[PDB]
Amino acid sequence: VKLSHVEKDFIAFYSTTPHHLSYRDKTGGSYFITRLISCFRKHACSCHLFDIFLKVQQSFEKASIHSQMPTIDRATLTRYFYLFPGN
Amino acid sequence: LKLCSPEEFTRLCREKTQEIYPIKEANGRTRKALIICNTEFKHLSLRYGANFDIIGMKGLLEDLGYDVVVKEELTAEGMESEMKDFAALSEHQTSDSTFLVLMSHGTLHGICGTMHSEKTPDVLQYDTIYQIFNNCHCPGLRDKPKVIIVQAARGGNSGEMWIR
Numbered sequence: 484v485k486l487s488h489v490e491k492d493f494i495a496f497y498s499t500t501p502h503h504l505s506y507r508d509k510t511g512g513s514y515f516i517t518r519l520i521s522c523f524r525k526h527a528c529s530c531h532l533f534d535i536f537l538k539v540q541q542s543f544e545k546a547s548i549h550s551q552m553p554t555i556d557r558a559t560l561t562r563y564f565y566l567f568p569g570n
Numbered sequence: 571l572k573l574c575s576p577e578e579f580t581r582l583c584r585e586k587t588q589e590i591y592p593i594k595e596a597n598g599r600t601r602k603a604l605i606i607c608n609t610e611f612k613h614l615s616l617r618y619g620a621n622f623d624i625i626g627m628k629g630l631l632e633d634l635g636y637d638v639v640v641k642e643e644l645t646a647e648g649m650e651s652e653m654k655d656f657a658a659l660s661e662h663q664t665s666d667s668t669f670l671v672l673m674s675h676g677t678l679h680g681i682c683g684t685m686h687s688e689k690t691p692d693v694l695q696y697d698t699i700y701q702i703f704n705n706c707h708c709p710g711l712r713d714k715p716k717v718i719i720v721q722a723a724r725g726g727n728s729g730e731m732w733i734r
Contacts, residue, residue, distance in 0.1 A: 487705045487712065488705055489704055489705055489706055490700060490705065492591075492714060492715050493704075494717055494718065495696075495718040495719075496717070496718070497722075497724065498720060498721050498722065499723055501724045501725060502678060502726075502727045503724060503728070504723050504725070504727065504728060504729060505676075505722065505723045510619070510622070511618050511619025512619050512626070513623050513721055515721060516627060519627075519630075520626050520630045523571070523634070524572065524630065524633075525572060527571065527572070527574075527634065528571075528573055529574070529578075532715070532717065546730050547730070548730065550729045550730035557700065562588075562589050563586075563591070564590070564591050565590055565591070565593070566574075566635075567579045567593055568571055568572070568573050568635075569574055569575075569576075570574060570579040570595075570596065
């Protein structure tokens, strides 16, 4: 028998802020997904999950005519989540 | 995908053990991830390019070490059923984490099933996802990172404006 939190170790990353639209590439790919993959492939080797998410958000920082801002939500991680790709 | 060296993997897991999530060695590791994607809808527009997103997320998660489960064209109850099935996989116990990727039409409070419309609501509350996977209902992922990626709009308003 042991005690446990009901809800813990969650993190959510939404493609947009509440009440707002999400956009796709001329080719049809989601900007959110495309940049998420790009930042993971480049930075998973040396950065934990939150820093990767932050880099994704930074890539949307400059406003354009179809802006969106990915949003970290309901985050209850208590440690850094390193993926250690290749191990 | 750029890889981390075994030396740095071992260095970090030793130097900052109490502040990183522990990683299981790949030999007996059984990482599972879930992708739920709705492309075609009874009342809503077709989501062109969704398969490009599936293929891109599937390949990235595999490169990260996850065996990827893909479920498509589900109602809200179908998404709930599939998530409960996925949350109960015994392979989570021999895993260290999971990713849950959800791609569909979205509202402020949830993700749309294939049958959604204003007159025929078909939505899975984002709050329900946490209930399905929390420490009460998902024992295999207790103490392990549960990463939710949400590919969906959260409303109908433009996200930019003009200023001076």
